[PDB]
């Protein structure tokens, strides 16, 4: 059957495997039939415009919805008591009770409270009316229209960029550093100085009056001559109220440091300074400006960029709660928990994605001859060593961390908490925005250490053994994703490199889970004033189960009761949806293909033999999902479940507290 157009192997599959594998391979452009590197890069090029158009229409939706259905105005008036709103609920299924309960934040009808700090971010960058947002939205739809127009025009042979424009990666690297990053950085400082900071200081800047307005009275005279002094004018008084004349300074570039007290956020002036500095550094480096493999392999490129975006989004999460850059976001606890957990989980996805494409590189692109004695060749030279070391630090950190937590559990249970192995984080004290690191924090840090170790252990045993191993010397033959080599050599289930990404996603979720668990319990403790609770109970595992999971679940799971619904109903329900989704992942992770294939055989029999029903038949012979599809659907359920459950819990834990 035609679909999938690109793969005749599949298109001639007489089964439902053709539809699944189609959708699974529909973006592995490399593997499409008759795909030359030229067309490959051109196709990829156009897809990226599609992606970006999506991101812009996504942002567009944010602004459109908050404008139309939000309470952004009411919130800018009372940003500490008004709950900000994400969008309207129209759902024919809600009962009157649930419409009433979701009728919140002084909204006429049922709404969803926002928890992306979008209100805070927009207030900070200057937006003050629904008009500013509506214009942002319509603008961003038009940007997306342009980006789509672009991908279309580009794939059109008129402007179809040949292999040249892509082979010029070095040019692209320098351009990214300066022409994109640097340029946009200082453009953003433009926005900050002209609109953000004014609107912060109570002065309305529209698009029609900023030509009129000058940011700094001394501005032009300072520009190009004694720029540093004039720019550092009267700094904004602590008295200053955000978006009011009261205590408004005039400085546009400063190094005041710390946080604006009203908003408990980094000074807009400090941010503008930061960005100006970042821009200068980036542009200078641009002007100033494994080679073989990186240019050769697009997998190497993504892998690198994913590991990059991995660390970047991790630091974004780590910094965006410690060093709030948005007004009132520090006070909005649910948003800050949500954003941290969000960005940390996306961090873990981008990280593991790095190692995934790592392994794809090692089975599709890495030629051992091509690079005689490169870093990668040396890495493989002593795989057994890199793995034995990662193994050891894993077994070590693991045995000891679990042992200590279990020791603490045992002695505390036996009613002798004195006997606990409480180790103080001395180096944390030395280094220390920074919150008290106790012996609890120590144990959890080591947990996270161990888990991150086992994750990299797995997703490197993957990318190293991808080429092969004693159990399967020639894996590169069979490729990245394949079921197994059969029950041949004691059994080879899960021997592929894809299987290592699969086995490591679990550890990535465990690791980020420990991270965000620690984050959220610590913060709930402080946000309730019972930081004592964390400090005392975080040292044995029953304390995590009793105080974190058991204790902060109560509100959420009372979201709907036989007595009635409250606003947390939708979260209680999502909480269960995530438990169900997670567990459903176990169906696919534990029950493997053969059981199902026998069962489905019998259903094919029953269908063919049932009068009236037999009148219709499949086009595609029903078959059980593939070995690997079982693993993949398992993992997507497990992951989706994991995320949805925890998202529900993060929201439901923090929301009642505030």
């Amino acid at each position: 059957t035609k679909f999938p157009s690109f793969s005749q192997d599949l298109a001639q599959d007489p089964t439902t495997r053709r539809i699944w594998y189609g959708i699974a391979t529909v973006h592995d452009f490399e593997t499409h039939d008759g795909m030359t590197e030229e067309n490959l890069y051109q196709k990829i090029f156009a897809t990226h415009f599609g992606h970006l158009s999506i991101i812009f229409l996504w942002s567009a939706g944010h602004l459109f919805h908050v404008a139309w259905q939000g309470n952004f105005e009411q919130w800018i008036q009372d940003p500490l008591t008004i709950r900000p709103i994400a969008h309207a609920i129209w759902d024919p299924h809600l009962g009157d009770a649930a419409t009433q309960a979701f009728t919140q934040a002084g909204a006429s009808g049922p709404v969803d409270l926002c928890y992306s700090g979008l209100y805070q971010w927009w207030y900070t960058i200057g937006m003050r009316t629904n008009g500013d947002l509506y214009i942002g939205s319509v603008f961003l739809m038009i940007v997306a229209a342009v980006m789509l127009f672009a991908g279309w025009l580009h794939l059109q042979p008129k402007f179809r960029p040949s292999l040249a424009w892509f082979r010029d990666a070095e040019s692209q690297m320098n351009h990214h550093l300066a022409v994109l990053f640097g340029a946009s950085s200082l453009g953003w400082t433009g926005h900050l100085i002209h609109v953000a900071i004014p609107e912060a200081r109570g002065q309305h800047v529209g698009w029609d009056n900023f030509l009129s307005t000058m940011p700094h009275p001394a501005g032009l005279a300072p520009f190009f001559t004694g720029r540093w002094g004039v720019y550092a004018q009267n700094p904004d008084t602590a008295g200053h109220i955000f978006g009011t004349s009261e205590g408004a300074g005039t400085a546009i570039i400063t190094f005041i440091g710390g946080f604006h007290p009203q908003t408990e956020a980094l000074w807009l002036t400090d941010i503008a300074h930061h960005h100006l500095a970042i821009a200068v550094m980036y542009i200078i480096a641009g002007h100033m400006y494994l080679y073989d493999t990186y240019n050769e392999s697009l997998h190497f490129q993504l892998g690198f960029h994913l590991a990059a975006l991995g660390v970047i989004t991790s630091v974004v999460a780590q910094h965006m709660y410690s060093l709030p850059s948005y007004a009132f976001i520090s006070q909005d606890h649910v948003t800050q928990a949500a954003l941290y957990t969000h960005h940390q989980y996306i961090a873990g996805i981008l990280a593991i994605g790095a190692f995934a494409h790592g392994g794809i590189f090692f089975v599709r692109d890495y030629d051992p001859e091509r690079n005689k004695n490169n870093v990668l060749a040396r890495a493989l030279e002593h795989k057994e060593a890199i793995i034995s070391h990662l193994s050891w630090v894993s077994m070590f950190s693991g045995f000891h961390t679990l042992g200590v937590y279990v020791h603490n559990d045992t002695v505390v249970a036996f009613g002798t908490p004195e006997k606990q192995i409480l180790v103080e984080p001395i180096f944390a004290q030395w280094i220390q925005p920074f919150m008290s690191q106790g012996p609890g924090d120590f144990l959890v840090h080591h947990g996270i250490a161990f888990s991150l170790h086992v994750t990299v252990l797995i997703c490197v045993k993957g990318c190293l053994d991808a080429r092969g191993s004693k159990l399967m010397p020639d894996k590169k033959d069979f490729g990245y994703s394949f079921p197994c080599d059969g029950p041949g050599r004691g059994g080879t289930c899960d021997i592929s490199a894809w299987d290592s990404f699969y086995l490591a996603f679990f550890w990535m979720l465990n690791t980020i889970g420990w991270i965000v668990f620690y984050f959220n319990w610590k913060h709930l403790a402080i946000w309730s004033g019972n930081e004592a609770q964390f400090n005392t109970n975080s040292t044995y595992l029953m304390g995590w189960l009793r105080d974190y999971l058991w204790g902060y679940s109560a509100q959420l799971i009372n979201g709907y009761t036989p007595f009635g619904v409250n606003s947390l109903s939708v979260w209680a329900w999502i909480f269960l949806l995530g438990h169900l989704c997670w567990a459903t992942g176990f169906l696919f992770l534990i029950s493997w293909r053969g059981y199902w294939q026998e069962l489905i055989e019998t259903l094919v029999w029953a269908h063919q033999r049932t009068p009236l029903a037999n009148l219709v038949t499949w086009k595609d012979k029903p078959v059980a999902l593939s070995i690997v599809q079982g693993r993949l659907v398992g993992l997507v359920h497990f992951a989706v479940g994991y995320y949805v459950t925890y998202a529900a819990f993060v929201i439901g834990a923090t929301a009642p507290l505030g």
């Binding site: 059957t1 035609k2 053709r18 539809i19 129209w90 759902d91 086009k619």
Partner: peptide, 30 residues
């Protein structure tokens, strides 16, 4: 256009989802 929700939601979810599922059905069965 307070009602636009009560139109856009069934249109997109029921009618668009239906049409999408129909189209994807034709697409993977032709």
């Amino acid at each position: 256009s307070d009602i636009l929700p009560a139109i856009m939601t069934p249109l997109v979810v029921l009618i668009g989802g239906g049409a999408a599922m129909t189209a994807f059905f034709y697409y993977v069965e032709r």
